Structures are given as C-alpha cells and as structure tokens.
Design a protein around this ligand. Structure first.
Ligand SMILES: [Cl-]
Ligand SMILES: [Cl-]
Ligand SMILES: [Cl-]
Ligand SMILES: [Cl-]
Ligand SMILES: [Cl-]
Ligand SMILES: [K+]
Ligand SMILES: [Mg+2]
Ligand SMILES: [Mg+2]
Ligand SMILES: [Mg+2]
Ligand SMILES: [Mg+2]
Ligand SMILES: [Mg+2]
Ligand SMILES: [Mg+2]
Ligand SMILES: [Mg+2]
Ligand SMILES: [Mg+2]
Ligand code: NA
Ligand code: NA
Ligand code: NA
Ligand code: NA
Ligand code: NA
Ligand code: NA
Ligand code: NA
Ligand code: NA
Ligand code: NA
Ligand code: NA
Ligand code: NA
Ligand code: NA
Lengths: 172, 142, 156, 29
RNA sequence: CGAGUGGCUUGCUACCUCGAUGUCGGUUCCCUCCAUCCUGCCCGUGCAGAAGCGGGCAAGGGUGAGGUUGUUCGCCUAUUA
RNA sequence: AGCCUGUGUACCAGGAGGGGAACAACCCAGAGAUAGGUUAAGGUCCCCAAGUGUGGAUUAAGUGUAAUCCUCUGAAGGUGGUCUCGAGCCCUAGACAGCCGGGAGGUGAGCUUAGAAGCAGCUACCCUCUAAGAAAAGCGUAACAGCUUACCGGCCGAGGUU
C-alpha cells in the first residue's frame, strides 16, 4: 500500500528519520511516526506513507498516520480550537490562567485551588464564563482542553446533582 | 582498565542472547572478548512481561542469596555466564576472559556480529537493557 | 451431584429393568412440544447436535429442554412450531453411598447416551428462527459442546 | 440492470419529448 | 442445570515409616498466600447529603482486650479504622 | 486414586549401554575382550558433539521452546486479535458509511375520551402531490411542540454487505 498527501500551499513539511515536522503561518508541529515497515517520506509536493505489507494491523496504522499528518496541516494553517464553559450552581468558580497552567479556585467551596499545566504551545484564552483552548498541535490542545474538564471531576458525590465544572462546548 | 581483547563486539541494537551465545562460543575457543555499549543492547518482546521477569529475579533470594545484577553491565555478563560452565576450570577461564562495558572505553569501534543486529525500522516490540536497568532502579551512570 | 461423576460412557450398558429395581422416575416432562397435533410440515428444521459421546442425566435433559421450550414462548403458548427431544434416559446410574467393600452402588438416577454427531433436539419453524436462540440456551445446560444445525432452510 | 431505473430513463425521455445520472441518461437520448 | 479451581474440612486408598518421624489445644518466634476484614486508589447504585449496599485494583501496614469451655470451633461483652 | 480385582502381551523384578534434566518397567537397544568405522533413538544458538541450514507460511501471547506421564493441566462458555478458503446479494445507471438538503399535504384520520393531534387503548390503514415521505419504526409531551427511523435528492468515489 501507498497513500499520497498533497501538502497545502500554505505549508512546508520536512522529515528526517522517523520524525516529521510541519510548519505553517500558525506554527510548527513535529511528530514521531514509527511502525514496523511503514515509510513516511516527503516527496517534494506530497508526503508519502507506504509499506510492503497489507495486513489489518498495518493498514490500521497507515490510516492513522494519514489523519495525523492532515491534522498537522490543519494545525499550522487554520489551527485547532476547543470551546469551553465554566459553570457553577452555588459557589462562584474562578478560572484563571497563571503561568503555563490554568488555575481554578473556590470549586464547590474548596479552599485549595485546583490546577493543571498546559501542554505545549497551547493558548488558553478566557473571557468571562467562556474558554477557548487553541494551538497547532491537536494532541496538545485536545489534552489541555480535556485536562481542564477532568480537573473538576468528582467521584465522591452524585454528579447529576453537583454539576459544577468546566466543559468542552465545541470540538473542532 | 586495559583489556587486551582479541575481539571488541558492539552490542548497540543487537539481540543480547544472540550476541552472548557467540561471545560464549568464542571465549571457550580461547578468545578474549569485550562487549561494548551494553546499555544499548536490546531484547525482543513485550516490555511489560520482559521487565516482570527481571524484577522477579531481583526479588528472589534468601540468606544463601541470589545476587542478580540490575545494571546493564552485569545483566549482560550474567547472560553470558549462563552459557558457560563457569564452575569448571575451563568455563571460569573463558568467562574471566570476557568483560562487558557501558559505552565504549576503547578507541576502535567494535564490530557487529552476524545475525545479531535488530532493524529498528521493522521492529517496535523490544527494549533497551538500559531501559530495563532504569526500571529495576539502577543508577543511570551512562 | 456433579456431572463429572456420570458424563462418561466408560461403564457397561446398564438398562435391564428385569434385574434392576428402585430406579428413580425421570424428571423429563414431555418429549413432544408445541403443535404436536400437526406433523413436520414446516419450511425450516433446525437441530441441536451433540459433538461428543456423553451421558446426559435426565436432570440436564429436563433443564435443557425447559430452558429452550420455556423460551420458545417468544412465539406464544400456542405458537406455530413443534419441538422434539428424541433421546430417552435408558442408562441406569449408581453411586456407592463399608468403604470400597461391597461397593456396587445403589440406583440413584438415569441418563441418556448420546453419540457425537446425533441430534438430541429437533425443532420445526416457519422462517422465524427464535429456535436458534432457544438452543443457545439448551446446549448451555448439557455437558458437551454442540452444533446448532439447520436442515430444510435455504432461506438465508 | 435495475428495472425501475430503466423505466425512469423512459419516463424522463418522455417528458423530455413533450437522479442526475438518470436525467443525463435521458438527455443522451 | 452445566463447566471448573483449590487442597482448609470430611471421606476413600494402603505408596512411605511399626530395630518408634513424640498426641490435641495453647503458648512463644519466624516466613509466606490472597479467595481483602480495615487502610489507599477506583466503578455501579434502587448514588440528594450523611450513612450504606455491591463490585475492581491492591498483600505495604494493621487486624487488638476480655467472660464460659482443655477445647480447635463456637457463644457472649465492651472497645475498634 | 501412584485404587481394588481379572485377561492377553511385552517388559522390570533378574536387563547393561544410548536417549529422556534427574527417574525399575517410555524410546533406541538386548551385552565376551580390544580396535577402526557407520548408524538407531534422540539431537545440531550456547551450556553440549552437530545448522544461528534451505524454500514457504502462521503466531505477538515469551503463546510456545512440555511424545508418553501421580509428574506435561486447563473446561463449559466467549473473541470485529489475526490469517486463509467458500457461498449469496448489492455496486461507476454511483453501491456501504458519513455530511447537507427534503421528509409534503386531505389531516390535528375515525373511534373512544374533557382530552388524544404517528406514537394510552380499539378499528382501519385509504389518495394526493411527487424525485421522496408510514393512517408512523423510536424518543418526547398533561395533551401539543420538539428530536429523529423509514422513505428521496445532492456531495463523495470503490468496493460493499450477509
Ligand atoms: Cl538474596
Ligand atoms: Cl559449570
Ligand atoms: Cl514489532
Ligand atoms: Cl537377551
Ligand atoms: Cl521470557
Ligand atoms: K510406625
Ligand atoms: Mg454519600
Ligand atoms: Mg524428631
Ligand atoms: Mg485479586
Ligand atoms: Mg508482606
Ligand atoms: Mg526379586
Ligand atoms: Mg559445538
Ligand atoms: Mg508458558
Ligand atoms: Mg498430554
Ligand atoms: Na527475548
Ligand atoms: Na535476587
Ligand atoms: Na463392614
Ligand atoms: Na455445553
Ligand atoms: Na480440583
Ligand atoms: Na525406622
Ligand atoms: Na502444640
Ligand atoms: Na495488605
Ligand atoms: Na473464649
Ligand atoms: Na527380560
Ligand atoms: Na538418563
Ligand atoms: Na515462556
């Protein structure tokens, strides 16, 4: 098998060994694409993913490599953004960005601030009760969004009743 | 310090067992061997199981004792000893004329023995002796 | 008591009631189920085939049968289908319940000897195989692994 | 060779006389 | 109803010891197993909360004092995570 | 049951030597001494004599590297883990999936019921417009609304489905 991904005019993609880097007006993302007998190479205007095998396990990764690359194309041009909404019922939850980590205070009345560190070059811009996680590395952005939501996780009590927390409102 | 090796073998990206089997055979033929870059030697398989085996060996023991190495240094050497009759005169001689090293203290670059190299491009399930030692608790002195 | 004790056909055939007394009654309720008024005039005919020779105690027969027919009420108490269990527990079974002295056991039950590949059950249905499910439940209560086989039915 | 498709290409050609692929079909007639 | 795992109970067998391998219980002192009682981290709930019930990972540590009985076991009391 | 008790046979007992990690009866083998040679069972990555042998395929579990067996467990049941072979049906007159658009009216059918309008229950389930569209397959409402399946069209482009 072999698949050819024509790279966008807006982008440049270089690759040495098992590492591929993609640079666009929005940034640069480098990934490792390592799997038995699957070669990834930049042939001038197109990135090539090929292998001499066609077994289910191989095809699976090939398809995965593809989406991973295309996702990088998209991240260096249009970028990736996740929209989130802080929400509380009794205690005013305060979500702030301090340093390279978003901090949340007064969660359900907690005295101890809950926090999480942002992944990579992900921007977490907060405006009122709305948050916007964005960056060129979908991996990083996606996690930072997630981590933020996970950060208000509650196991001790009935979630249906204690719904406070920040949630992913719009997935790219 | 200073070891007149008739042969210097480079373990980097080689199957430990296959290297050892050959280093054993040569030492018994009278050759003085030195294994280099042990920390970069490799063993195929699911890292989770592999590590369980070596962790078990560390835990095994009693007053009589079962001293099992944690550094990629000894791990490799113990592997070789298992392929020599180290309790016989001949065996102990052969074993003692073989030493394993972390990295390469020589000037010459060791040679790669046939059939012992692992192609990283067509293999994802394998582990580095160094990785194992770090898991075991060794002090990464390399 | 476990099937482990009687599932094997390693003992001589022991069925002569003229020389054996005190044989427990069978727990199997019926052998003909459904519309026994009608004859096999159905489009589809599925069978449950035993894949290993074994002895099946009337215990398992009743449980296997009930579990299947009781379920075949996905068609209704008076549904259109007929169910048949073609085997009967002829083999009398003993238990030595003195230690190994005078150990010829006493009659404790009956079992049916089935040979690998025979069909123990046979159902007759119109293209409405809810029976295929009645059987997944039946071979669930008998010792051997089994094959659910469909004969007259090229309506796949 | 679906028949309903064959009949449509006809009915279409009929109104043309007095799916896109089916229209393009009739047009080719 | 069917299929199993363990080798703590009970039974079976009579392989080992009758030129003897000292009994039960207790005690003291050491190691271990996990099928987890508590503790840590979790899932479900007929999960509002609190208090529970059930389940998963998990053997690091803990699992105590007494009344009857030689008892093992067990019954009983007050403490206890 | 490494149980008890028959039977036929070969073995141990009273049978070496080779192999099986060890091991009365499993395998080769029945054996005077000494010597050369070739095999048997079994084995040829090292320990350990002989292949890191050849053509091809499978397995990712260290499954396995365990003829036989008190000794080497692993079952019923289950598996879109993966590989191989077959049959039927659908498809460039554009299939399968996804996304977009359409899902219309007589009409909120009749009946019952204050009520019931696709969807409490009962009966029926007709015809119009049309490229589609049930007298409604599933949610939802006090009943409506709302959200979708069926059904049609578009985008897409290659196998798909049982
Ligand atoms: Cl020790
Ligand atoms: Cl030795
Ligand atoms: Cl691999
Ligand atoms: Cl002889
Ligand atoms: Cl292993
Ligand atoms: K004795
Ligand atoms: Mg609570
Ligand atoms: Mg003594
Ligand atoms: Mg456990
Ligand atoms: Mg402990
Ligand atoms: Mg004798
Ligand atoms: Mg040799
Ligand atoms: Mg194993
Ligand atoms: Mg066997
Ligand atoms: Na290995
Ligand atoms: Na040890
Ligand atoms: Na007696
Ligand atoms: Na079964
Ligand atoms: Na058992
Ligand atoms: Na004695
Ligand atoms: Na004692
Ligand atoms: Na513990
Ligand atoms: Na007491
Ligand atoms: Na003899
Ligand atoms: Na031997
Ligand atoms: Na193994």
């Amino acid at each position: 098998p072999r698949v050819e991904l024509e790279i966008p005019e807006d982008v440049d993609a270089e690759q040495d060994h098992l590492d591929i880097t993609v640079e666009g007006d929005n940034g640069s993302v480098t990934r490792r694409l390592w799997y038995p007998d699957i070669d990834v190479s930049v042939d001038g205007d197109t990135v090539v993913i090929e292998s001499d095998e066609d077994n289910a396990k191989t095809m699976s990764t090939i398809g995965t490599f593809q989406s991973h690359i295309e996702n990088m194309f998209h991240g260096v041009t249009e970028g990736w953004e996740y929209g989130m909404e802080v929400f509380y019922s009794h205690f005013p939850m305060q979500v702030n960005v301090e340093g390279d980590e978003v901090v949340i205070e007064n969660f359900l009345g907690e005295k101890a601030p809950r926090r999480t560190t942002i992944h990579g070059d992900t921007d977490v811009e907060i405006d009122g009760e709305e948050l916007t996680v964005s960056g060129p590395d979908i991996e990083a952005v996606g996690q930072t969004a997630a981590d933020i939501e996970q950060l208000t996780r509650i196991n001790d009590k009935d979630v249906r009743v204690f719904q406070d927390g920040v949630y992913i409102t719009r997935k790219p | 310090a200073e070891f007149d090796a008739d042969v210097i073998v480079d373990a980097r990206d080689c199957i430990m067992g296959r290297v050892a089997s050959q280093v054993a055979e040569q030492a018994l033929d009278g050759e003085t061997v030195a294994v280099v870059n042990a920390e970069r030697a490799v063993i195929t398989g699911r890292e989770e199981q592999i590590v369980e085996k070596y962790e078990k060996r560390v835990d095994i023991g009693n007053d009589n004792g079962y001293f099992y190495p944690k550094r990629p240094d000894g791990i490799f050497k113990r592997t070789i000893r298992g392929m020599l009759p180290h309790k016989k005169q001949r065996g102990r001689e052969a074993f003692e004329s073989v030493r394993v090293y972390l990295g390469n203290p020589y000037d010459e670059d060791g040679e790669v023995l046939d059939g012992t190299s692992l192609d990283r491009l067509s293999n994802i399930k394998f582990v580095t002796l160094g990785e194992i030692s770090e898991t075991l608790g060794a002090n990464k002195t390399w | 008591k476990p099937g482990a004790m009687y599932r094997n056909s390693s003992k001589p055939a022991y069925t002569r009631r003229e020389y054996i007394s005190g044989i427990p009654g069978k727990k199997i309720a019926q052998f003909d189920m459904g519309n026994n008024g009608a004859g096999p005039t159905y489009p589809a005919q599925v069978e449950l085939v035993v894949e290993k020779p074994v002895q099946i105690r009337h215990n398992a027969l009743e449980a296997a049968r009930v579990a299947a027919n009781r379920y075949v009420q996905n068609s209704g108490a008076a549904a259109n289908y007929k169910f048949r269990i073609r085997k009967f527990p002829f083999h009398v079974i003993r238990e030595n319940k003195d230690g190994m002295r005078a150990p010829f056991g006493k009659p404790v039950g009956t079992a049916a000897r089935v040979h690998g590949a025979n069909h123990i059950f046979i159902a007759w249905v119109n293209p409405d195989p809810n029976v295929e499910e009645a059987w997944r439940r039946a071979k669930m209560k008998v010792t051997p692994t089994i094959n659910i086989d469909s004969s007259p039915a090229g309506n796949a | 060779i679906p028949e309903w498709k064959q009949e449509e290409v006809d009915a279409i050609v009929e109104m043309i006389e007095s799916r896109n692929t089916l229209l393009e079909r009739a047009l080719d007639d």
